[PDB]
């Protein structure tokens, strides 16, 4: 019993150090000496949970509770295990039981708060975190998770004080070599130093290294040349997001456009098949597709990669949901590169390169990254919009001349227009204009009444609000629409006679400084409106109130989050997109540019704050990039007042989304291929990774 206590206490310290194998051995020894040791069972369970041995963990949590029925911490931690098994009901039953046993138990309230947040109940998550902090005022995990909840709903009460405290918490945790409470993916939202952001990432990367060290794997032996692969470079794309996810919406065409004479493409899915066409396409077009979600053990999964003989292993998750960076910690390939899916450094020694570009990641700030910079020649960003939304390549309008009040798009648009009596062609290449006649009145009536669809001259004419009722795969971007679609300002309650500024990002990317810039722009441009999304809806009244305090009178119009195709299509109704400087639109940036909408941006220092500028630079619209806040406001106001200049800039975006490299997936793949061969030839000549420009 006292012998068991010493073993348990030692195990606890071994665990804090990341010596997982030794911790497990010691807990098991403690239980051998004292079988009825509830704390030892619970501690062993927690380390088993950390290793992914969820059923074995459960068994030990239950044993702890059988021994001590009021062991609130066992229930709390059992709840986390059930949550990891996707058993939300079981998780809530355990958290609520823990809180019933001990209502003053801060950790349980914090765990309950997290599952509320994950479920989409932000107000209850906020409340539970505030309870946790009331009970234990020094609780870094709860404070930082609360800070993100408040960010999500644009609650900026004591914002500057909150930001200072977050930085203080991180400093203190890094100085004591604890895992920081700010998640790496969230670190770009807070005014932390580049050193601190890199250090956060590094500590999270180290969790993966600790988990793989239990396996006792030697270094893998890596190919020195391309002899076994018939002169083909074997590239492995590892992602949890081959499916309906923004990353597939960016790169689903890339695997299939690789040159099979020089490349062999392996796609390693970390997620099961979600039934979507995105997954179908990558599975069909990759040379090889391997479902690693079927191989939960990271040792056997990493062996699976090494057999395939991969030269370049590409990490598309970083520290996003579904990552299995334990696979990369094992180094099953000689070159390992970060690409596209994660807008930051891994901070980890097991990743060699980050694929970026000179606009996103200039040489100056190379200390921000642990990896070496590998530059793509234009932008590292890419979008599959040309393939997914080819019906948006051309448009027509109805003259109720405006390009963005009443818009038609469709694969068969040309044939429909050719069936109409008096269509006017406005040169920009050109925009057809349907004059106000009986046919135009039929279309406007469909929209006003909220009808799903009509037929004109045998052509199917669809209401853009009803896409999920007509073809749900066309709504998600899984299929191209087979009808002509109508999109109007009146559908979204937008003004017919004023400038529409838009931003379609999640509201967490907005901060007080940003909303102040936007208010300043709106005050300078009479009648204009700012179009935002209910992303989530509970953020709306906070935004509206802070805007009221800055002096804005119904100048901000919210719309619901839409299905993918509608979201992209409705961007055609805006005049100008106002990008979020804190963290730019990434996928959302590509979406707005595909509609022909100019985006004003102010590049910061973080990778996440510079993506929009890189997109615009590739597009060829340097005039939309601001060097400071005054320039951002001046650019936006000029676009909203100088209507000939707006027309020119919109025409430039409309043309250059086709003529520039930005959406050209073939050109991108070929450039990516050149970069892979540089990486390979550099390594084949015995060299360590170095920067590449």
């Amino acid at each position: 019993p006292t012998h068991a206590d010493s073993l348990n206490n030692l195990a606890n310290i071994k665990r804090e150090q990341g010596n997982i194998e030794e911790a497990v051995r010691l807990y098991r020894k403690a239980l051998e000496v004292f079988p009825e040791f509830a704390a030892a069972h619970s501690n062993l369970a927690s380390v088993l949970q950390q290793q992914g041995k969820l059923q074995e963990a459960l068994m030990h949590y239950k044993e702890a509770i059988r021994i001590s029925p009021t062991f609130a911490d066992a229930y709390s931690n059992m709840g986390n295990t059930l949550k990891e098994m996707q058993d939300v009901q079981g998780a809530l039953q355990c958290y609520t039981r823990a809180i019933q046993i001990n209502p003053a138990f801060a950790d349980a309230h914090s765990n309950l708060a997290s599952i509320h947040k994950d479920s989409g109940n932000i107000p209850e998550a906020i409340a539970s975190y505030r309870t946790a902090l009331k009970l234990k005022p020094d609780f870094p995990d709860a404070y930082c998770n609360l800070a993100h909840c408040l960010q999500i709903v644009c609650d900026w009460t004591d914002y500057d004080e909150r930001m200072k405290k977050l930085v203080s918490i991180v400093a203190d945790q890094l100085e004591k070599n604890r895992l920081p409470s700010v998640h790496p993916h969230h670190s770009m939202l807070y005014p932390l130093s580049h050193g601190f952001r890199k250090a956060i990432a590094e500590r999270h990367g180290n969790l993966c290294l600790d988990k793989i060290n239990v396996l006792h794997k030697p270094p893998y032996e890596h190919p020195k040349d391309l002899k076994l692969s018939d002169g083909r470079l074997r590239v492995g794309y590892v992602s949890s997001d081959f499916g309906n996810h923004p990353t597939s919406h960016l790169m689903q065409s890339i695997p299939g456009m690789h040159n099979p004479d020089k490349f062999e493409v392996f796609c390693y899915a970390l997620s099961p098949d979600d039934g979507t066409n995105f997954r179908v396409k990558v599975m069909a077009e990759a040379n090889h597709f391997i479902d690693l979600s079927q191989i939960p053990c990271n040792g056997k999964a990493a062996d699976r990669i090494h057999q395939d003989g991969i030269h370049i292993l590409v990490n598309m998750n970083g520290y996003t949901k579904g990552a299995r960076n334990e696979l990369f910690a094992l180094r099953p390939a000689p070159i390992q590169a970060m690409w596209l899916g994660y807008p930051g450094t891994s901070g980890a020694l097991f990743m060699d390169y980050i694929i970026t570009d000179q606009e996103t990641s200039p040489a100056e700030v190379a200390e921000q990254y642990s990896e070496k910079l590998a530059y793509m020649p234009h932008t590292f960003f890419i979008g599959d919009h040309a393939n997914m939304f080819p019906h948006l390549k051309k448009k027509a309008v109805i003259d109720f001349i405006y390009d963005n009040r009443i818009v038609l798009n469709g694969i068969d648009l040309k044939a429909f227009l050719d069936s109409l009596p008096d269509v006017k062609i406005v040169k920009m290449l050109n925009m057809p204009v349907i004059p106000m006649n009986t046919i135009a009145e039929a279309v406007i009536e469909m929209i006003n009444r909220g009808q799903i669809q009509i037929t004109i001259n045998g052509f199917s004419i669809s209401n853009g609000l009803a896409t999920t009722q007509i073809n749900n795969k066309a709504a998600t971007g899984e299929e191209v629409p087979r009808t002509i679609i109508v999109t109007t300002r009146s559908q979204y309650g937008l003004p017919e006679d004023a400038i529409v500024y838009c931003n379609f990002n999640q509201l967490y990317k907005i901060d007080p400084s940003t909303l102040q810039m936007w208010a300043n722009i709106l005050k300078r441009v009479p009648n204009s409106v700012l179009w935002l999304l209910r992303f989530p809806a509970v953020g709306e009244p906070n935004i509206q109130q802070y805007a009221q305090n800055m002096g804005l009178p119904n100048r901000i119009i919210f719309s619901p989050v839409a299905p993918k195709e509608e979201h992209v299509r409705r961007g055609q109704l805006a005049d100008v997109c106002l990008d979020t400087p804190l963290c730019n639109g990434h996928t959302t940036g590509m979406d707005v540019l595909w509609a022909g909408t100019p985006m004003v941006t102010m590049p910061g220092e973080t990778l996440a704050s510079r993506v929009a500028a890189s997109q615009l630079t590739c597009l060829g619209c340097l005039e939309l990039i601001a060097k400071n806040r005054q320039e951002y406001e001046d650019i936006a106001v000029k676009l909203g007042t100088d209507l000939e200049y707006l027309k020119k800039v919109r025409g430039k975006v409309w043309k250059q989304r086709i003529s520039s490299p930005l959406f050209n997936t073939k050109q991108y793949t070929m450039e990516l291929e050149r970069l892979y061969l540089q990486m390979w030839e550099h390594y084949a000549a015995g060299n360590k990774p170095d920067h590449m420009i």
Partner: peptide
């Protein structure tokens, strides 16, 4: 319903 990039 709307997938996003998340931590």
């Amino acid at each position: 319903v709307t997938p996003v990039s998340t931590a």
